[PDB]
Amino acid sequence: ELVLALYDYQEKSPREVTMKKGDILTLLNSTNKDWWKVEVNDRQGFVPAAYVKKL
Prior knowledge:
By secondary structure, the protein is mainly β. The chain has no helices and five strands. It has one domain: Roll (SH3 type barrels), CATH 2.30.30.
C-alpha cells in the first residue's frame, strides 16, 4: 500500500518521521485511527493519518 503526503510534516518526537507534500510513502500500519506507520525512503515511523491519502 502507498499513500500520498497531502502536507509537509516535520517530526516532533522519536517515533515520528518527516515527509514533504507530494511524497509517495509506503504504508506499513494503519490500525491506529490517528497515526499511521509509513516508510519514507530509508526511515520508518509515524505521521498523522489525516495528512496522507491512500492510493
